[PDB]
Paper text:
Gamma delta (γδ) T cells, a unique T cell subgroup, are crucial in various immune responses and immunopathology. The γδ TCR is a heterodimer comprising TCRγ and TCRδ chains, discovered in the mid 1980s9–12. Each TCRγ or TCRδ contains an extracellular domain (ECD) with a Vγ/Cγ or Vδ/Cδ domain, a membrane-proximal connecting peptide (CP), a transmembrane (TM) helix and a short cytoplasmic tail. After antigen engagement, the γδ TCR–CD3 complex triggers the phosphorylation of ITAMs within the cytoplasmic tails of CD3 subunits, initiating downstream events.
Residue numbers in the entry:
A (entry chain m): 258 to 291
B (entry chain e): 33 to 153
C (entry chain n): 271 to 307
D (entry chain g): 26 to 138
E (entry chain d): 22 to 126
F (entry chain b): 27 to 56
G (entry chain a): 26 to 54
H (entry chain f): 33 to 69, 74 to 154
């Protein structure tokens, strides 16, 4: 059970990363359009 | 009165008892001497601390007792029962011990974002 | 529980794929930005 | 026994697998995958492998003072990478691929310069 | 005295020939039957310094037995390979976001 | 009863966020 | 033992962002 | 020499005895004869239906008929936990899905980029 809760933390980290990178892409695309 | 302390970090486990602060202390585990053998690097004592490397759930998990010289094996009236299922480099954290760090990271990211946004103005 | 492990390891790979898509999109747009400037 | 010394420790809840071969002698040499892999000393008789979640495999061998013994080829399938695609996992992956591709394509479309 | 810490399928028990007195730690769930005590489930990690009296052969003397349990199930087996990469790439991601904000303005 | 309701709720929320961001950035440009 | 709770954690955070951006849009619509 | 080969697909555990193909061979599981009434019964091929982690798991030794088994080559230990239609992702499968994902993303973005200039 010490490894089931490790993937449940890596998934949180990956979702956090995706939420950051989608904002990065959105902001840079908004800049590029201008 | 006299308390007991035990610290488990990853795999190694360290025990200590302050019952006899003025005398270095020998130990037992189900009536066998484990304190002082100048071998078996998996174990080994100190002035007060005793370290048990490669701790196992099904073995050396019993009635530990700390006793100095001039003390009968049954002379000590304070015992301990330990059952630890340890693994290699594993700790304990609940939901509120990861919520705080995730919120801290979000807050610091927002703070840096606002700092760099105001800097352009 | 086994079901929790199944769902968790299902979501991990999907989010990794989405992250890879985002990274490749960022590479494309940063190449475009460098070309523009 | 019939000349089969190597066994596997059972009745354990800790996530670890061990070995056991009985040879009433001293310097009971150990082996793994046929080739020489180690030794054995006093106060311990059980070679260890680690967590079963890493799926130990391969042929294992032990030898006391007798000749070449016979193996105990061990197979484990603690999956731990166990995506279940039956009715609500392939559809989710398909939807997450399709909508992400569409949202990427719209953004690429809206780059004209 | 060695107080037998009896273990059920998933529950632990403290057994002494005379009523058990709790001093420091967890008092658990006291069974209505005398001379028995249900600390709790084996997975909740009970602990605490207790005290009972003499057994069926060794009356009129009293001692204590500290009880400790670390049968953790909320534990996490984290490796420095993935947990460090996550932090490093999160740092690079927030640096990228900060750089992107400057471009917006 | 909620093995995948987590990610099902998360998926819709991301979509709504992206859609509402798309409209917002438009008005900002004016 | 930890997964179901961490669901609502990230699900709520993005919901806050969505609501905040909705308010920002409705103040400029 | 020859190890013991096992292949599992969902709840269908398949293993064979790649020791004596042309022969007659029987089975046990933890020193208990297994086969014939489910359970697969071939001279080398065998199937575990309804495999369980804690009730079919032990020493699979495979003897020819008429030969007591303690003289065989060796044994097997199997502690497989089964699924209901789940896939084991090795290092190859994740790599191939990642490669096809990035290829299908690139080949679809570069199509609309050419369409952007129209
Ligand atoms: C995976 C994601 C990040 C891909 C990109 C999706 C989002 C961020 C894209 C798709 C449509 C885009 C919008 C399309 C049109 C306009 C109008 C223009 O005058 C300003 C930029 C603006 C408002 C764009 C901002 C970025 C945008 C909202």
């Amino acid at each position: 059970t010490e490894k089931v809760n490790m993937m449940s933390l890596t998934v949180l980290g990956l979702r956090m990363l995706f939420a950051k990178t989608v904002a990065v892409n959105a902001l840079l695309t908004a800049k590029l359009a201008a | 009165q006299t308390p007991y302390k035990v610290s488990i970090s990853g795999t190694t486990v360290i025990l200590t008892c302050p019952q006899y602060p003025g005398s270095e202390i020998l130990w037992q585990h189900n009536d066998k001497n484990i304190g002082g053998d100048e071998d078996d690097k998996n174990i080994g004592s100190d002035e007060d601390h005793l370290s048990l490397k490669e701790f196992s759930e099904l073995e050396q998990s019993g009635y530990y007792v700390c006793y100095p010289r001039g003390s009968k094996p049954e002379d000590a009236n304070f015992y301990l029962y330990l059952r630890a299922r340890v693994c290699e480099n594993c700790m304990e954290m609940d939901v509120m011990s990861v919520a705080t760090i995730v919120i801290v990271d979000i807050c610091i990211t927002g703070g840096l974002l606002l700092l760099v946004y105001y800097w352009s103005k | 529980t086994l079901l929790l492990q199944l769902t968790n390891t299902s979501a991990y790979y999907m989010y990794l794929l989405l992250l890879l898509k985002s990274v490749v999109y960022f590479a494309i747009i940063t190449c475009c930005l460098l070309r523009r400037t | 026994k019939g000349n089969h010394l190597v066994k596997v420790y059972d009745y354990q809840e800790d996530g670890s697998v061990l070995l056991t071969c009985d040879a009433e002698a001293k310097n009971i040499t150990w082996f793994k995958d046929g080739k020489m892999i180690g030794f054995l000393t006093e106060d311990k008789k059980k070679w260890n492998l680690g967590s079963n979640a890493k799926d130990p495999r391969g042929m294992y061998q032990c030898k006391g003072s007798q000749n070449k013994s016979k193996p105990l080829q061990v197979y484990y399938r603690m999956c731990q990478n166990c995506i279940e695609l039956n009715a609500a996992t392939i559809s989710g992956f398909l939807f997450a691929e399709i909508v992400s591709i569409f949202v990427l394509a719209v953004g690429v479309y809206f780059i004209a310069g | 005295f060695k107080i037998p810490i009896e273990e059920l399928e998933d529950r632990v028990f403290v057994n002494c020939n005379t009523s058990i007195t709790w001093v420091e730690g967890t008092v658990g769930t006291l069974l209505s039957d005398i001379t028995r005590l249900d600390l709790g489930k084996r997975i909740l990690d009970p602990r605490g310094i207790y005290r009972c009296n003499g057994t069926d052969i060794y009356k009129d003397k009293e001692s204590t037995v500290q009880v400790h349990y670390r049968m953790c199930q909320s534990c996490v087996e984290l490796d420095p390979a993935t947990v460090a990469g996550i932090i490093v790439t999160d740092v690079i991601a927030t640096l990228l976001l900060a750089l992107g904000v400057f471009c917006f303005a | 009863l909620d093995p995948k309701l987590c990610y099902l709720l998360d998926g819709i929320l991301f979509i709504y966020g992206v859609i509402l961001t798309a409209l917002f950035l438009r008005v900002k440009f004016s």
